[PDB]
Design an enzyme around this catalytic site. Structure first.
Site, mmCIF file in Angstrom:
data_model
loop_
_atom_site.group_PDB
_atom_site.id
_atom_site.type_symbol
_atom_site.label_atom_id
_atom_site.label_comp_id
_atom_site.label_asym_id
_atom_site.label_seq_id
_atom_site.Cartn_x
_atom_site.Cartn_y
_atom_site.Cartn_z
ATOM 1 N N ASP A 32 0.803 -1.236 0.000
ATOM 2 C CA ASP A 32 0.000 0.000 0.000
ATOM 3 C C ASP A 32 0.830 1.277 0.000
ATOM 4 O O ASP A 32 2.024 1.234 -0.335
ATOM 5 C CB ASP A 32 -0.907 -0.067 1.276
ATOM 6 C CG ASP A 32 -2.293 0.383 0.903
ATOM 7 O OD1 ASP A 32 -3.230 -0.427 0.752
ATOM 8 O OD2 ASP A 32 -2.456 1.597 0.709
ATOM 9 N N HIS A 63 -4.297 5.534 3.774
ATOM 10 C CA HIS A 63 -4.791 4.274 3.227
ATOM 11 C C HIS A 63 -4.063 3.046 3.749
ATOM 12 O O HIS A 63 -4.691 2.120 4.339
ATOM 13 C CB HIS A 63 -4.810 4.462 1.713
ATOM 14 C CG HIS A 63 -5.579 3.457 0.918
ATOM 15 N ND1 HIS A 63 -4.978 2.332 0.386
ATOM 16 C CD2 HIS A 63 -6.894 3.423 0.564
ATOM 17 C CE1 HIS A 63 -5.894 1.660 -0.247
ATOM 18 N NE2 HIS A 63 -7.063 2.286 -0.167
ATOM 19 N N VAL A 80 -9.035 0.303 17.789
ATOM 20 C CA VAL A 80 -9.859 -0.757 17.187
ATOM 21 C C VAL A 80 -9.244 -2.125 17.467
ATOM 22 O O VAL A 80 -8.455 -2.383 18.391
ATOM 23 C CB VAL A 80 -10.116 -0.436 15.688
ATOM 24 C CG1 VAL A 80 -11.233 0.576 15.473
ATOM 25 C CG2 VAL A 80 -8.838 -0.106 14.930
ATOM 26 N N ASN A 154 -13.434 -0.335 -7.566
ATOM 27 C CA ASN A 154 -14.494 0.494 -7.001
ATOM 28 C C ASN A 154 -15.279 1.033 -8.184
ATOM 29 O O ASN A 154 -15.832 2.133 -8.225
ATOM 30 C CB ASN A 154 -13.804 1.432 -6.007
ATOM 31 C CG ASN A 154 -13.354 0.679 -4.765
ATOM 32 O OD1 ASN A 154 -14.084 -0.245 -4.345
ATOM 33 N ND2 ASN A 154 -12.235 0.970 -4.106
ATOM 34 N N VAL A 173 -5.048 -14.611 -8.241
ATOM 35 C CA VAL A 173 -5.463 -13.592 -7.297
ATOM 36 C C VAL A 173 -6.965 -13.671 -6.988
ATOM 37 O O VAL A 173 -7.818 -13.747 -7.880
ATOM 38 C CB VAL A 173 -5.044 -12.192 -7.841
ATOM 39 C CG1 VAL A 173 -5.466 -11.094 -6.871
ATOM 40 C CG2 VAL A 173 -3.560 -12.068 -8.140
HETATM 41 CA CA LIG Z 1 -6.543 -2.091 19.629
#
Ligand SMILES: [Ca+2]
Length: 274
Positions: A32, A63, A80, A154, A173
């Site tokens: 990324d 991103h 999170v 997208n 893939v």
């Molecule tokens: Ca955490």
């Protein structure tokens, strides 16, 4: 204290966690924009950059850091919680900050992944055009036994022609589409014959650069859920082969409708688990 993105429970990732499989010893490469290695909810063990001027370990465009966290946001008391939170996370900088990358960089990253025994490679990127060299290193890394998951695109629809990008198009893939919390297929998610499966890609909250968290949408977000779910599995049955792992994600998922739009459908980690 800690929040649980509506997606870990959606794919029953958290039921594997309970059993005690969180990807310990599983090496995931996220190809990324990079990952804010200083993010309190993430621990990047290594990596590389093939982007010039950009060091890696730093994220100019949020991103990489966001996709990273869906895979491994640490299992602590804040932020999170990633899919396979015990996983060996390597960040491969393949997108130069304005978000784009040239194939030379992509293929290099792929190669790096393979050459450093990366059990998983997450490509939440694409293009509507391929290349000879990409198809070879995606096929090569998989023949090599890596699990290669890439975001679908997208694009929404484009008639009844495939709107799935590259490398997701390379049947070596796995092409991941995006659903939401009511398991509805996201609007922008790409359709084609190549779609493999679905994952949460709408309103997905994860780590955002400079010790904060945010909500983004996309297949780019769908893909990582699939990349962790395999680490989990890889942590339960560490003997399995890539294909062994793919089949299970594949042929054991939840039916949402036609293959064109939903692939085999929503992934079930528990069932796939064993
Ligand atoms: Ca955490």
């Amino acid at each position: 204290a800690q929040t649980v993105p509506y997606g870990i429970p959606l794919i029953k990732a958290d039921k594997v966690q309970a059993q005690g499989f969180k990807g310990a010893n599983v090496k995931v490469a996220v190809l990324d924009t990079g990952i804010q290695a200083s993010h309190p909810d993430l621990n990047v063990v290594g990596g590389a950059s093939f982007v010039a001027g950009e060091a890696y370990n730093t994220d100019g465009n949020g991103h990489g850091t966001h996709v990273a966290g869906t895979v491994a946001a640490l299992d602590n008391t804040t932020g999170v919680l990633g899919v396979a939170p015990s996983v060996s996370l390597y960040a491969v900088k393949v997108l130069n900050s304005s978000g784009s990358g040239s194939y030379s960089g992509i293929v290099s990253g792929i190669e790096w992944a393979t050459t450093n025994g990366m059990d998983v490679i997450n490509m939440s990127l694409g293009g509507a055009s391929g290349s000879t060299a990409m198809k070879q290193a995606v096929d090569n890394a998989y023949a090599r036994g890596v699990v290669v998951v890439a975001a679908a695109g997208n694009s929404g629809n484009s008639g009844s022609t495939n709107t799935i990008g590259y490398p997701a198009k390379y049947d070596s893939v796995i092409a991941v589409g995006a659903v939401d919390s009511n398991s509805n297929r996201a609007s922008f998610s790409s359709v084609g014959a190549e779609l493999e499966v679905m994952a949460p890609g709408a309103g997905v909250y994860s780590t955002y650069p400079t010790n904060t968290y945010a909500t983004l949408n996309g297949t780019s977000m769908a893909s990582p859920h699939v990349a962790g779910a395999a680490a989990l599995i890889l942590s339960k049955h560490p003997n399995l082969s890539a294909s062994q792992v793919r089949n299970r994600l594949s042929s054991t998922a939840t039916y949402l409708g036609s293959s064109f739009y939903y692939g085999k459908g929503l992934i079930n980690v528990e069932a796939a688990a064993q």
